[PDB]
Enzyme design. Structure first.
Site, PDB file in Angstrom:
ATOM      1  N   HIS A   1       0.875  -1.184   0.000  1.00 10.10           N
ATOM      2  CA  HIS A   1       0.000   0.000   0.000  1.00 10.10           C
ATOM      3  C   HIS A   1       0.929   1.256   0.000  1.00 10.10           C
ATOM      4  O   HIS A   1       0.710   2.275  -0.693  1.00 10.10           O
ATOM      5  CB  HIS A   1      -0.812  -0.036   1.331  1.00 10.10           C
ATOM      6  CG  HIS A   1      -1.397   1.277   1.765  1.00 10.10           C
ATOM      7  ND1 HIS A   1      -2.379   1.955   1.059  1.00 10.10           N
ATOM      8  CD2 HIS A   1      -1.155   2.030   2.868  1.00 10.10           C
ATOM      9  CE1 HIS A   1      -2.731   3.052   1.688  1.00 10.10           C
ATOM     10  NE2 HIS A   1      -1.997   3.141   2.791  1.00 10.10           N
TER      11      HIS A   1
ATOM     12  N   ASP B   1       9.930  22.287 -25.125  1.00  7.34           N
ATOM     13  CA  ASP B   1       9.921  20.936 -24.555  1.00  7.34           C
ATOM     14  C   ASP B   1      10.879  20.944 -23.376  1.00  7.34           C
ATOM     15  O   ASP B   1      11.200  22.049 -22.918  1.00  7.34           O
ATOM     16  CB  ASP B   1      10.242  19.811 -25.613  1.00  7.34           C
ATOM     17  CG  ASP B   1       9.539  18.508 -25.236  1.00  7.34           C
ATOM     18  OD1 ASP B   1       9.950  17.807 -24.272  1.00  7.34           O
ATOM     19  OD2 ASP B   1       8.449  18.253 -25.805  1.00  7.34           O
TER      20      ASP B   1
ATOM     21  N   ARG C   1       1.716   0.194  15.546  1.00 11.54           N
ATOM     22  CA  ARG C   1       1.732   0.036  14.093  1.00 11.54           C
ATOM     23  C   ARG C   1       1.942  -1.415  13.653  1.00 11.54           C
ATOM     24  O   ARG C   1       2.592  -2.155  14.341  1.00 11.54           O
ATOM     25  CB  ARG C   1       2.853   0.865  13.439  1.00 11.54           C
ATOM     26  CG  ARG C   1       2.466   2.369  13.452  1.00 11.54           C
ATOM     27  CD  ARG C   1       3.512   3.303  12.868  1.00 11.54           C
ATOM     28  NE  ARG C   1       3.697   3.027  11.427  1.00 11.54           N
ATOM     29  CZ  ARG C   1       4.612   3.645  10.697  1.00 11.54           C
ATOM     30  NH1 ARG C   1       5.311   4.659  11.273  1.00 11.54           N
ATOM     31  NH2 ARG C   1       4.656   3.434   9.424  1.00 11.54           N
TER      32      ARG C   1
HETATM   33  C1  HEA Z   1       3.801  14.545   2.847  1.00 13.89           C
HETATM   34  C2  HEA Z   1       4.155  13.931   3.943  1.00 13.89           C
HETATM   35  C3  HEA Z   1       4.655  14.479   5.215  1.00 13.89           C
HETATM   36  C4  HEA Z   1       4.950  15.755   5.561  1.00 13.89           C
HETATM   37  C5  HEA Z   1       4.811  17.028   4.676  1.00 13.89           C
HETATM   38  C6  HEA Z   1       5.419  15.701   6.863  1.00 13.89           C
HETATM   39  C7  HEA Z   1       5.778  16.846   7.684  1.00 13.89           C
HETATM   40  C8  HEA Z   1       6.258  16.770   9.026  1.00 13.89           C
HETATM   41  N1  HEA Z   1       6.389  15.660   9.793  1.00 13.89           N
HETATM   42 FE1  HEA Z   1       6.015  13.733   9.216  1.00 13.89          FE
HETATM   43  N2  HEA Z   1       5.674  11.817   8.591  1.00 13.89           N
HETATM   44  C9  HEA Z   1       5.347  11.371   7.284  1.00 13.89           C
HETATM   45  C10 HEA Z   1       4.913  12.238   6.248  1.00 13.89           C
HETATM   46  C11 HEA Z   1       5.016  13.688   6.293  1.00 13.89           C
HETATM   47  N3  HEA Z   1       5.349  14.493   7.331  1.00 13.89           N
HETATM   48  C12 HEA Z   1       5.389   9.980   7.151  1.00 13.89           C
HETATM   49  C13 HEA Z   1       5.022   9.026   5.910  1.00 13.89           C
HETATM   50  C14 HEA Z   1       5.833   9.558   8.391  1.00 13.89           C
HETATM   51  C15 HEA Z   1       6.102   8.136   9.021  1.00 13.89           C
HETATM   52  C16 HEA Z   1       7.087   7.374   8.170  1.00 13.89           C
HETATM   53  C17 HEA Z   1       7.155   5.935   8.642  1.00 13.89           C
HETATM   54  O1  HEA Z   1       7.668   5.558   9.745  1.00 13.89           O
HETATM   55  O2  HEA Z   1       6.626   5.125   7.807  1.00 13.89           O
HETATM   56  C18 HEA Z   1       6.069  10.728   9.216  1.00 13.89           C
HETATM   57  C19 HEA Z   1       6.641  10.583  10.497  1.00 13.89           C
HETATM   58  C20 HEA Z   1       7.175  11.686  11.290  1.00 13.89           C
HETATM   59  C21 HEA Z   1       7.885  11.580  12.486  1.00 13.89           C
HETATM   60  C22 HEA Z   1       8.373  10.347  13.136  1.00 13.89           C
HETATM   61  C23 HEA Z   1       7.395   9.957  14.234  1.00 13.89           C
HETATM   62  C24 HEA Z   1       7.694   8.560  14.662  1.00 13.89           C
HETATM   63  O3  HEA Z   1       7.758   7.681  13.769  1.00 13.89           O
HETATM   64  O4  HEA Z   1       7.656   8.287  15.904  1.00 13.89           O
HETATM   65  C25 HEA Z   1       8.163  12.910  12.934  1.00 13.89           C
HETATM   66  C26 HEA Z   1       9.005  13.312  14.088  1.00 13.89           C
HETATM   67  O5  HEA Z   1       9.310  14.497  14.103  1.00 13.89           O
HETATM   68  C27 HEA Z   1       7.525  13.730  11.924  1.00 13.89           C
HETATM   69  C28 HEA Z   1       7.339  15.182  11.933  1.00 13.89           C
HETATM   70  C29 HEA Z   1       6.908  16.146  10.946  1.00 13.89           C
HETATM   71  C30 HEA Z   1       7.000  17.545  10.993  1.00 13.89           C
HETATM   72  C31 HEA Z   1       7.520  18.550  12.099  1.00 13.89           C
HETATM   73  C32 HEA Z   1       6.617  17.944   9.739  1.00 13.89           C
HETATM   74  C33 HEA Z   1       6.520  19.430   9.319  1.00 13.89           C
HETATM   75  O6  HEA Z   1       6.953  19.526   7.971  1.00 13.89           O
HETATM   76  C34 HEA Z   1       5.037  20.024   9.401  1.00 13.89           C
HETATM   77  C35 HEA Z   1       5.144  21.592   9.319  1.00 13.89           C
HETATM   78  C36 HEA Z   1       3.733  22.203   9.281  1.00 13.89           C
HETATM   79  C37 HEA Z   1       3.190  22.858  10.293  1.00 13.89           C
HETATM   80  C38 HEA Z   1       3.735  23.047  11.675  1.00 13.89           C
HETATM   81  C39 HEA Z   1       1.745  23.356  10.040  1.00 13.89           C
HETATM   82  C40 HEA Z   1       1.663  24.693   9.265  1.00 13.89           C
HETATM   83  C41 HEA Z   1       2.247  25.785  10.173  1.00 13.89           C
HETATM   84  C42 HEA Z   1       1.689  26.892  10.816  1.00 13.89           C
HETATM   85  C43 HEA Z   1       0.233  27.276  10.604  1.00 13.89           C
HETATM   86  C44 HEA Z   1       2.605  27.847  11.634  1.00 13.89           C
HETATM   87  C45 HEA Z   1       2.520  27.924  13.145  1.00 13.89           C
HETATM   88  C46 HEA Z   1       2.826  26.510  13.650  1.00 13.89           C
HETATM   89  C47 HEA Z   1       3.509  26.320  14.799  1.00 13.89           C
HETATM   90  C48 HEA Z   1       3.911  27.526  15.583  1.00 13.89           C
HETATM   91  C49 HEA Z   1       3.913  25.015  15.391  1.00 13.89           C
HETATM   92  N4  HEA Z   1       6.831  12.958  11.075  1.00 13.89           N
END
Ligand code: HEA
Ligand SMILES: CCCCCCCCCCCCCCCCCC(=O)OCC(COC(=O)CCCCCCCCCCCCCCCCC)OC(=O)CCCCCCCCCCCCCCCCC
Ligand SMILES: CCCCC/C=C\C/C=C/C/C=C\C/C=C\CCCC(=O)O[C@H](COC(=O)CCCCCCCCCCCCCCCCC)COP(=O)(O)OCCN
Ligand SMILES: CCCCCC/C=C\CCCCCCCCCC(=O)O[C@H](COC(=O)CCCCCCCCCCCCCCC)COP(=O)(O)OC[C@@H](O)CO
Ligand SMILES: CCCCCCCCCCO[C@@H]1O[C@H](CO)[C@@H](O[C@H]2O[C@@H](CO)[C@@H](O)[C@H](O)[C@@H]2O)[C@H](O)[C@H]1O
Ligand code: CUA
Ligand SMILES: [O-][O-]
Ligand SMILES: [Cu+2]
Ligand SMILES: [Mg+2]
Ligand code: NA
Ligand code: NA
Ligand SMILES: [Zn+2]
Lengths: 43, 73, 514, 98, 259, 105, 227, 79, 144, 46, 58, 49, 84
Positions: free
Chosen positions: C61, C91, C438
């Site tokens: 998946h 292109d 998980r």
């Molecule tokens: C498109 C996919 C995508 C995106 C964009 C992100 C973005 C982020 N991810 Fe994530 N994440 C995944 C996909 C993604 N993630 C996937 C697939 C996994 C697990 C993988 C696995 O083990 O299979 C994962 C797992 C993962 C973990 C591991 C957790 C664990 O396995 O125990 C962590 C740890 O920090 C993390 C954090 C973050 C953070 C900080 C962002 C940041 O980029 C988000 C930033 C956005 C904001 C904060 C919101 C907008 C902001 C505001 C409106 C401003 C004001 C906000 C504040 C003052 C806080 N993610």
């Protein structure tokens, strides 16, 4: 956006057919497999 | 009849933005106050009151007598 | 003619079309696997078998939705169609190598289906960690077919990246600086640099896994002095940038949709948006160990990966606010594409916020390898990357095809999907906080209620997916041909009509320096 | 320590490469390598836009450092104006074929 | 008729045949590893070479013979090759990361020391120092070749490019002999794993770069390059400097510092 | 930036130019409506009289509709603007959208 | 353990888990407030017929929208990092216990004084005694003294596993060739459950952990009876 | 000569989550001490502390495999 | 009147409230009487009848502002059809429970749950807030 | 050259909407059906 | 050697509408057909080998 | 002239709404789904030992 | 550094040729001397069956499955010791 009226209109009835056929196409094979899961497992 | 008064005609969108953003800010403060009284402090007080006169041995003896343990009948 | 045209293409629109069709097919495959997951979990007990078949389905998946659906649609499909139009280029730099990027993906998808058919499949997680993934705990061909599938998808994307970087740098009108190219063009160039730097590191790590499996190397095997945790570093070194690769073209399509249906000539704060996407691409490379908080890392290292991960919120917040400031004062058109983008802004923000909760290593001890992580990453993938894809697809469908969708059906489609994805994922936060791990095929009884609702939601998303197929059929079946499009002065890709001639910009645009 | 035996571009370049080389020596830009410099852009003094057909897309960067570019087709005939700043453009069609 | 300087490429079959060759090589390797059979593999390797040959042939037809490589097209090729090299640097970086990770923290199974108990490294002052002198010398010969080509001197170009290739072949033969003479193997824990995999892919790159130089040598013999337009030679020279620099990193990290 | 009075004056001048052409009339109205304001009566008065010089009755009625539109929910502004324009509407023979039944959905 | 329809964390059994609860409450309030403010501003931007489509100046407002998030991040990171180091602090354990992950069960070794070791396997659903919890009960529980600092050392003899007990805030990966350390101190007697938290093959779902926390005297007699 | 040993104390040389080298170093220290003692006409009881510490920390299967390898002539540490 | 596909590069008509004066007239071809009407528009507009003024507006423009900004009943169709497909989904869930799911485990039988609930209370599961905290150990019943 | 225009810049025909429906059904239907069949193939081995 | 590049430029610029990969003559056609036969041939054989590997040998 | 939504809007909303409530209430209550709700205030604890 | 040569009038073929023959090749000829001198076989070490060496988790896909690809009988012992 603007567009021309349809060159080959699809009436409510033709849409009901396209919608049924489309849904059946996802539903029937998967339904057949989930239905026969037991057969597969204790086979 | 009577003439109509000249209304404000400029900065109408900016004005609406200003009034509502300050509205949003005052709601945000009101919500945090609700939050800190309904969730956070509530938690701090449930924990502290639980452990204030907590008697761990008496807790153990009730569990033991109820038969939950492998090491203690 | 047909073989010349569709198997031997050197045309960036036709190749873009091939990638959209390939990704739409992979999307059906990923959707079925996502329903098999939720069928297993929809009631307590065992449906399919034990965790091996179950985790084969979870692994497939993830690989199909990431590598065969999102990346080919956003980058192969939209990048190829729109990037050269948006800069008035005739292109891509390398129109022949662009076709091999496409043609390596059906072979890669064949190798992935093959791995699931031989032996007992690769039940590894899409992270494919050893030793579960090595030759003693996953003996036989499935894992090797998986590593090969990745090598071909990694080659397809490295060569694509090279093609997109060269095109965006080298093929703009000579008067246009990089700071006069649209935001979607910037997002594809930043995505391509990330692919270029990160996929060779993946290819080195999966290669080492291939040799520990087949040539008696011990990179990851302690008996030979190797370290299972080394594989996790090399994988996440790629894996973190790869999720910024999955979202950045989404951000660029969102900027263009929001600007268009606000009736604006330009996004609010253009250089701030360029700034934000470059800052996210950069910080995306220095944070990978936040996938490794429970592996046994020194506390100062944990502290560093906490703080550097949290910083990403700042540039990412400038983009969310700048989208809101683009809507500000707009003549709002409530088109189905604008609903996908509004949904995106709110629900990507919720999922970025739970990424922020997960950045805290201390809290992550308890949240890691639980459904809280699964809820996080589906808010950003099913309600972030997938929302930008659907918004982009309905906005540009009339450009690519020359035909209109029925807007009322597309609004209906939106509403259904919106309900199903929130129903599916929202309650997974509670299953996470309360401790459900998980990659489980079954769960202690207590977790029943949220799992039941979650799976009912995944069936509502099913219905939206089936309806989407009917909606595309209805457009091609009615043949409502496009006449006039608004705001062409600030959206060059519409300026050659719908669809554009096979050859566009044979005579380049005229832009003076002044 | 040195003889010859290596062809030059002048002797051996061919096709479009040679056409570009030879036009550049004449100060000409038939393949649009260079950015045109603007005139004042008035109705008396319009930006002159060569084309081999009867319409060409113009992009207008109205003010220096605008990130937003204003695009429109320019047709044979009377000068047209950028819909954003009004600067004047006039198409000068034809030939290129020598 | 176009009035831009870019190349519209004729519809071609090689992207398909190269993609299928990738299928045939990967499923061939799977067959070889798991089903005791080489057939699919040798079919993939055959169509792979055929594909590369026809595709680069057509690039030569479209440039030297048809004249589509205007300066704008050359510039794009320059970027392409640079970005390609960047990707290869990051591929090697993952094997250097592996090597430092295991050698800076040697585990108890190794004796907790580096080099592991029971490993007798090669002496870095013998053949590995010779290899180093070879590739560095070939960096100097290929620069002479380049300058001779710019100055229009066909004979000295050919001479220096030939000395460059001869050194590339030398390095490959010395390395093949050290592999055979080595008392440790790829199966000798993480020492042999890091050693043969990192130097093995480096040696594969020496073989590709030396083939690319030989291609430049025959096209030179056939007068394809002018004194000003010779990007395939420039690309082969950049790639050769990349292969040189990788070696210097291998020599310092693995042969010298890891001994 | 400038005062409101100088903004208005620059717009009254733009439309009063005796030989203003049809393009300039359109460009001026289409630019003007992008601003966070409903244009002062004196500006609308000058735009209407340019309509007159250009023999363009229908654009005169459209300029009145766009004044109503720019007011949004502030239902008091448009009838105030029409009140102030009445002598010009009378002198030029310009019927309002409401007098022409063009407010009917 | 988790109870039906549970929304949040399992109640804290250790001072560290209690600190995580308060820090999550602090971070969740920030999550709700920012999410709510976004939704509200979206609805604001979409609910007026007033327009303003000319070019808008950005630098002024970009200041607000970089500085206020920076400050919010510092107010998260401060208590976050206090807890991190609080958890890292030296403590002087009274007891060391090892656990080794296997496909699919855990073994335990208490070798401070005697060579005490045993296997701990899930009770199969067909053999649960009435009252017992499906997928969660074991045959041999991990008996430990309450109110005392325990060092847990975690590794594996085959694939990766992960040893977790949510109500103690514990999760330490089980990696072969590696000995990972955590500390555990329970404020109360009772039974505390966890589950394998790294994917490890066919019976990943079915290799749980149960700690039995009791007074030291009971622990010592139990230990002696397990030789 | 300092007992009432309960478990192995904090050792500032090994302050982190990974304790593998702590177990390893104490295994080597015990066997090195025993070898010095068995030879030189002294008594292994002076090696006690290392033996307590490594028994406390080290998985049974690690000790057991390391013991088998000393017996075999294949233990890669220096003793 | 008639817009063609082959006209895409030509200035076109649009009705948009933010673009009140589009680049071309809605109708460019004039009949004899429309031509006479345009000549009459060059004299005083006080001499134009109401119908002449409407006609002049309709030559220039397609829809008025009130017409182009009109609201529709489209929401009804949208929300109704969405709820129809959601209710369709429950038929799939019915089918699945009937033909695919077997019995759930015996641990959900009512007597099992009562005993397990007692045992969770005996072990004081979540005694601070979450579970046992809601049981009154003194009155032997659930807290009000 | 190649055909240009709506319905002609695509590798499938939209000339007859019912042939199109059958082709689209086979196309999307086989993607969705494949994992059910692979599950069934796995179960039937062992 | 002599510089015969001018002859190859005439051959490859001949206005015979052949694509570049066939423009050298009949030998290009032969080499094309051998490549594409091996590729298509090998791909069917890989599918055969998948289907064989998909089932246990007992 | 009245469009599809003027003519059929009300009946689609009314019938979609009613069908949706009916079938989800049926699915939720009548086919033996185990929701596993809280025992709190619901279950009378029974002797297990 | 400046290394210690000189020159710099300009960057030409003649200079890079000077460097190829007056520095680069003589360095190769000298290392060639150094190496082909410390050549000759060294006394193979006593075989010890270390469990971190001679790893076999899966047979090699050639020969008898137990020989490495560039197996040298003189210096590469098998898991069971040197070949006889
Ligand atoms: C498109 C996919 C995508 C995106 C964009 C992100 C973005 C982020 N991810 Fe994530 N994440 C995944 C996909 C993604 N993630 C996937 C697939 C996994 C697990 C993988 C696995 O083990 O299979 C994962 C797992 C993962 C973990 C591991 C957790 C664990 O396995 O125990 C962590 C740890 O920090 C993390 C954090 C973050 C953070 C900080 C962002 C940041 O980029 C988000 C930033 C956005 C904001 C904060 C919101 C907008 C902001 C505001 C409106 C401003 C004001 C906000 C504040 C003052 C806080 N993610
Ligand atoms: C799907 C079924 C859910 C069933 C709900 C359970 C019943 C609650 C018992 C009723 C209460 C009974 C008493 C129990 C108290 C226990 C407190 C606790 O231990 O605490 C821990 C809990 C506390 O959480 C909750 O208390 C429920 C969540 C409330 C968040 C607001 C969204 C409303 C949710 C409900 C509808 C879902 C729609 C999704 C909303 C969209 C995505 C957010 O767990 C979480 O941390 C969940 C983590 C969520 C993080 C995402 C934040 C998104 C916010 C969005 C803001 C926009 C405004 C909405 C405006 C929304 C309009 C768009
Ligand atoms: C002669 C000098 C140069 C050496 C080149 C000779 C042959 C190998 C080719 C090079 C490929 C490079 C590395 C591939 C993996 C391992 C080879 C390492 C180099 C080598 O040749 O190692 C030999 C082992 O070869 C073995 O296992 C042989 C196994 C051969 C099969 C190759 C396995 C599959 C390769 C993986 C390809 C993946 C490519 C990545 C794609 C990137 C996509 C982005 C060392 O021999 P030994 O007897 O153990 O010790 C010497 C004792 N006297
Ligand atoms: C043991 C072997 C197993 C694996 C097989 C690899 C085998 C070796 C192949 C060696 C590479 C040969 C490359 C030959 C390219 C010839 C075409 C060429 O060089 O074309 C030049 C353009 O550059 C161009 O495309 C340049 C494009 C070249 C890029 C090539 C670089 C390396 C590719 C190899 C793949 C690496 C694999 C690494 C594994 C991770 C043509 O332009 P000019 O030279 O300006 O001429 C024009 C003048 O005549 C006008 O006056
Ligand atoms: C995860 C996505 C799937 C969602 C669920 C889909 C809903 C299922 C759609 C209907 O599927 C069909 O159901 C029939 C039962 O209703 C099955 O007939 C079986 O049922 C019998 C009736 O009991 C027999 O008459 C037949 O032979 C037959 O095999 C039939 O094979 C299957 O195709
Ligand atoms: Cu053990 Cu999962
Ligand atoms: O990866 O987040
Ligand atoms: Cu990450
Ligand atoms: Mg984990
Ligand atoms: Na299940
Ligand atoms: Na050069
Ligand atoms: Zn302009």
């Amino acid at each position: 956006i603007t567009a021309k009226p349809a060159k080959t209109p699809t009436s409510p009835k033709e849409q009901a057919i396209g919608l049924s056929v489309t849904f059946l196409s996802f539903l029937l094979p998967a339904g057949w497999v989930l239905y026969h899961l037991d057969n597969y497992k204790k086979s | 009849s009577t003439a109509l008064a000249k209304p404000q005609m400029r900065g109408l969108l900016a004005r609406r933005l200003r009034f509502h953003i300050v509205g949003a800010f005052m709601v945000s403060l009101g919500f945090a106050t609700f939050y800190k009284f309904a969730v956070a402090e509530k938690r701090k007080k449930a924990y502290a009151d639980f452990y204030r006169n907590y008697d761990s041995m008496k807790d153990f003896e009730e569990m033991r007598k109820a038969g939950i343990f492998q090491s203690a009948k | 003619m047909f073989i010349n045209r569709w198997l031997f293409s050197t045309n960036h629109k036709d190749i873009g079309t091939l990638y959209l069709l390939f990704g739409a097919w992979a999307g059906m495959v990923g959707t079925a696997l996502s329903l098999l997951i939720r069928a297993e979990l929809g009631q307590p007990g065992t449906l399919l078998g034990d965790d091996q078949i179950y985790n084969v389905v979870v692994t497939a998946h993830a690989f199909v939705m990431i590598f065969f659906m999102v990346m080919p649609i956003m980058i192969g499909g939209f990048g190829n169609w729109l990037v050269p139009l948006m800069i008035g280029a005739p292109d891509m730099a390398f129109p022949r190598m662009n076709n091999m990027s496409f043609w390596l993906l059906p072979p890669s998808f064949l190798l992935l289906l093959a791995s699931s058919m031989v032996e007992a499949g690769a039940g590894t997680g899409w992270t494919v960690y050893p030793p579960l993934a090595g030759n003693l705990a996953h003996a036989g061909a499935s894992v090797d077919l998986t590593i090969f599938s990745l090598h071909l998808a990694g080659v397809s994307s490295i060569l694509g990246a090279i093609n997109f970087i060269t095109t965006i740098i080298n093929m703009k009108p000579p008067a246009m600086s990089q700071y006069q190219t649209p935001l979607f063009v910037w997002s594809v160039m930043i995505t391509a640099v990330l692919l270029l730097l990160s996929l060779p590191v993946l290819a080195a790590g999966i290669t080492m896994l291939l040799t520990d499996r087949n040539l008696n190397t011990t990179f990851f095997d302690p008996a030979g002095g190797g370290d299972p945790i080394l594989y996790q570093h090399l994988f996440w070194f790629f894996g973190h940038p790869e999720v910024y690769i999955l979202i950045l073209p989404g951000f660029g399509m969102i900027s263009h949709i929001v600007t268009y249906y606000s009736g604006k000539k330009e996004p609010f704060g253009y250089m701030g948006m360029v700034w934000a996407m470059m800052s996210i691409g950069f910080l995306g490379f220095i944070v990978w160990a936040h996938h490794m908080f429970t592996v046994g890392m020194d506390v100062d290292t944990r502290a560093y990966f906490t703080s550097a991960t949290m910083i990403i919120a700042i540039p990412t917040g400038v983009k969310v606010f700048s989208w809101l400031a683009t809507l500000h004062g707009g003549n709002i058109k409530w088109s189905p594409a604008m609903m996908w983008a509004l949904g995106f802004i709110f629900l990507f923000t919720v999922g970025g916020l739970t990424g922020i909760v997960l950045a805290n290593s201390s809290l992550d001890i308890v949240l890691h390898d639980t459904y809280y992580v699964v809820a996080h990453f589906h808010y950003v993938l099913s309600m972030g990357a997938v929302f930008a894809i659907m918004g982009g697809f309905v906005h540009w469908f009339p450009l690519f095809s020359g035909y209109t969708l029925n807007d009322t059906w597309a609004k209906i489609h939106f509403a259904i999907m919106f309900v199903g994805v929130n129903m599916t994922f929202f309650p997974q936060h509670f299953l996470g906080l309360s401790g459900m791990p998980r990659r489980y095929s079954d769960y202690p009884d207590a977790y029943t209620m949220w799992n039941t609702i979650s799976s009912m939601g995944s069936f509502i998303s099913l219905t939206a997916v089936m309806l989407m197929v009917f909606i595309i059929w209805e457009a091609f079946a009615s043949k409502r041909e496009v006449l006039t499009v608004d705001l062409t002065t600030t959206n060059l890709e519409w300026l050659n009509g719908c669809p554009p001639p096979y050859h566009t910009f044979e005579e380049p645009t005229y832009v003076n320096l002044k | 320590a040195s003889g010859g035996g290596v062809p030059t571009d002048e002797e051996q370049a061919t096709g479009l490469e040679r056409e570009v080389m030879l036009a550049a020596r004449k100060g000409q830009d038939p393949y649009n390598i260079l950015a045109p410099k603007a005139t004042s852009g008035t109705k008396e003094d319009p930006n002159l836009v060569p084309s081999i057909t009867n319409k060409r897309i113009v992009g207008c960067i109205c003010e220096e450092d605008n990130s937003t570019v204003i695009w429109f087709w320019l047709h044979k005939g009377e000068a047209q104006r950028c819909p954003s700043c009004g600067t004047h453009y006039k198409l000068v069609p034809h030939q290129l074929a020598h | 008729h176009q009035t831009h300087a870019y190349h519209m490429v004729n519809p071609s079959p090689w992207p398909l045949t190269g993609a299928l060759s990738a299928l045939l090589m990967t499923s061939g390797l799977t067959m070889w590893f798991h089903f005791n059979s080489m057939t699919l593999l040798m079919i993939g390797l055959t169509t792979n070479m055929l594909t590369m040959y026809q595709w680069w042939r057509d690039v030569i037809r479209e440039s030297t013979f048809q004249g589509h490589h205007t300066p704008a097209v050359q510039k794009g090729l320059r970027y392409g090759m640079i970005l390609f090299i960047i990707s290869e640097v990051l591929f090697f970086t993952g094997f250097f990361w592996a090597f430092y990770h295991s050698s800076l923290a040697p585990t108890p199974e190794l004796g907790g020391c580096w080099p592991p108990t029971g490993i007798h490294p090669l002496n870095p002052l013998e053949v590995p120092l010779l290899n180093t002198s070879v590739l560095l010398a070939s960096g100097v010969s290929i620069t002479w070749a380049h300058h001779s080509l710019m100055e229009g001197d066909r004979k000295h170009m050919l001479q220096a490019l030939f000395i460059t290739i001869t050194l590339g072949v030398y390095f490959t033969l010395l390395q093949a002999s050290e592999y055979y003479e080595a008392p440790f193997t790829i199966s000798d824990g993480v020492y042999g794993s890091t050693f043969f995999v990192a130097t093995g892919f480096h040696g594969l790159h020496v073989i590709i770069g030396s083939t690319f130089l030989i291609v430049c040598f025959f096209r030179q013999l056939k007068f394809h390059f002018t004194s000003n337009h010779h990007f395939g030679f420039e690309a082969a020279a950049w790639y050769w400097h990349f292969v040189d620099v990788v070696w210097l990193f291998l020599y310092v990290s693995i042969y010298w510092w890891g001994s | 930036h400038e005062t409101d009075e100088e903004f208005d004056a620059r717009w009254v001048t733009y439309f009063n130019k005796p030989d203003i052409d049809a393009w300039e009339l359109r460009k001026g109205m289409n630019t003007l409506v992008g601003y966070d304001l409903v244009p002062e009566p004196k500006i609308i008065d000058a735009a209407l009289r340019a309509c007159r010089r250009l023999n363009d009755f229908a654009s005169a009625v459209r300029i009145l509709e766009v004044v109503k539109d720019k007011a949004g929910p502030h239902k008091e502004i448009y009838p105030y603007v029409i009140q102030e324009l009445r002598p010009t509407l009378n002198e030029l023979g310009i019927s309002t959208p409401e007098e022409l039944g063009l407010d009917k959905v | 353990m988790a109870y039906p329809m549970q929304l949040g964390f399992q109640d804290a059994t250790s001072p560290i888990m209690e600190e995580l609860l308060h820090f999550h409450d602090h971070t969740l309030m920030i999550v709700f407030l920012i999410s709510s403010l976004v939704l509200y501003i979206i609805s604001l931007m979409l609910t007026t017929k007033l327009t303003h489509t000319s070019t808008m100046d950005a630098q002024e407002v970009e200041t607000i929208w970089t500085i206020l998030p920076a400050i919010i991040l510092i107010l998260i990171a401060l208590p976050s990092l206090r807890i991190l180091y609080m958890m890292d602090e030296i403590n002087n354990p009274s007891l060391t216990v090892k656990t080794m992950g296997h496909q699919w069960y855990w073994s335990y070794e208490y070798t401070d004084y005697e060579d005490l070791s045993f296997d701990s396997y899930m009770i199969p659903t067909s053999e649960l005694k009435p009252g017992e919890l499906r997928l969660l009960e074991v045959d041999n529980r991990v008996v430990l003294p309450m109110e005392m600092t325990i060092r847990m050392l975690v590794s594996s003899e085959d694939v990766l596993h992960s040893w977790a007990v949510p109500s103690l805030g514990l999760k330490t990966d089980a990696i072969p060739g590696r000995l990972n350390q955590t500390t555990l101190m329970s404020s109360r007697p009772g039974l505390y459950y966890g589950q394998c938290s790294e994917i490890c093959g066919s019976n990943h779902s079915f290799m749980p952990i149960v700690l039995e926390l009791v007074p030291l005297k009971y622990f010592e007699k139990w230990s002696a009876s397990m030789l | 000569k300092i007992k009432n040993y309960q478990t192995a104390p904090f050792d500032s040389r090994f302050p982190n989550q990974n304790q593998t080298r702590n177990c390893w170093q104490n295994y080597l220290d015990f066997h090195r001490c025993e070898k010095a003692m068995t030879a030189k006409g002294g008594d292994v009881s002076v090696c006690e502390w290392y033996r307590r510490v490594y028994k406390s920390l080290c998985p049974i299967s690690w000790v057991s495999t390391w013991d088998d390898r000393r017996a075999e002539g294949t233990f890669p540490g220096k003793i | 009147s008639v817009v063609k596909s082959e006209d895409y590069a030509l200035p076109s008509y649009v009705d948009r409230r933010d673009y009140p004066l589009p680049d071309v007239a809605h109708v460019k071809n004039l009949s004899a009487s429309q031509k006479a009407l345009k000549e009459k528009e060059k004299a005083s507009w006080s001499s134009l009848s109401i119908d002449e003024k409407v006609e002049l507006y309709r030559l220039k423009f397609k829809e008025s502002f009130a017409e182009m900004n009109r609201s529709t009943n489209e929401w009804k169709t949208v929300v109704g059809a969405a709820m129809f497909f959601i209710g369709f989904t429950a038929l799939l869930l019915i089918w699945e429970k009937h033909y695919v799911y077997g019995p759930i485990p015996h641990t959900f039988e009512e007597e099992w749950v009562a005993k397990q609930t007692k045992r969770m209370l005996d072990m004081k599961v979540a005694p601070i807030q979450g579970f046992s905290a809601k049981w009154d150990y003194d009155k032997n019943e659930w807290k009000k | 050259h190649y055909e240009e225009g709506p319905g002609k810049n695509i590798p499938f025909s939209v000339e007859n909407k019912w042939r199109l429906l059958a082709m689209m059904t086979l196309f999307f239907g086989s993607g969705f059906a494949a994992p059910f069949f692979i599950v069934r193939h796995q179960l039937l081995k062992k | 050697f002599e510089n015969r590049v001018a002859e190859k430029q005439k051959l490859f610029q001949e206005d015979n509408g052949l694509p570049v990969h066939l423009k050298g003559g009949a030998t290009d056609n032969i080499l094309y057909r051998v490549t594409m036969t091996l590729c298509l041939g090998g791909t069917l054989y890989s599918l055969y080998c998948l289907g064989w590997a998909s089932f246990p040998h007992k | 002239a009245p469009d599809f939504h003027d003519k059929y809007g009300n009946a689609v909303l009314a019938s979609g709404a009613t069908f949706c409530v009916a079938v989800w209430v049926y699915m939720a209550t009548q086919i033996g789904i185990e929701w596993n709700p809280s025992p709190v205030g619901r279950v009378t604890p029974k002797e297990w030992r | 550094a400046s290394a210690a040569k000189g020159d710099h009038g300009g960057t030409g073929a003649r200079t890079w040729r000077f460097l190829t023959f007056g520095l680069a090749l003589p360095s190769v000829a000298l290392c060639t001397l150094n190496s082909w001198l410390h050549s000759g076989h060294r006394e193979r070490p006593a075989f010890i069956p270390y469990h971190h060496l001679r790893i076999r988790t899966k047979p090699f896909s050639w020969g008898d499955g137990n020989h490495t690809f560039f197996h040298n009988p003189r210096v590469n012992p098998l898991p069971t010791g040197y070949e006889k």
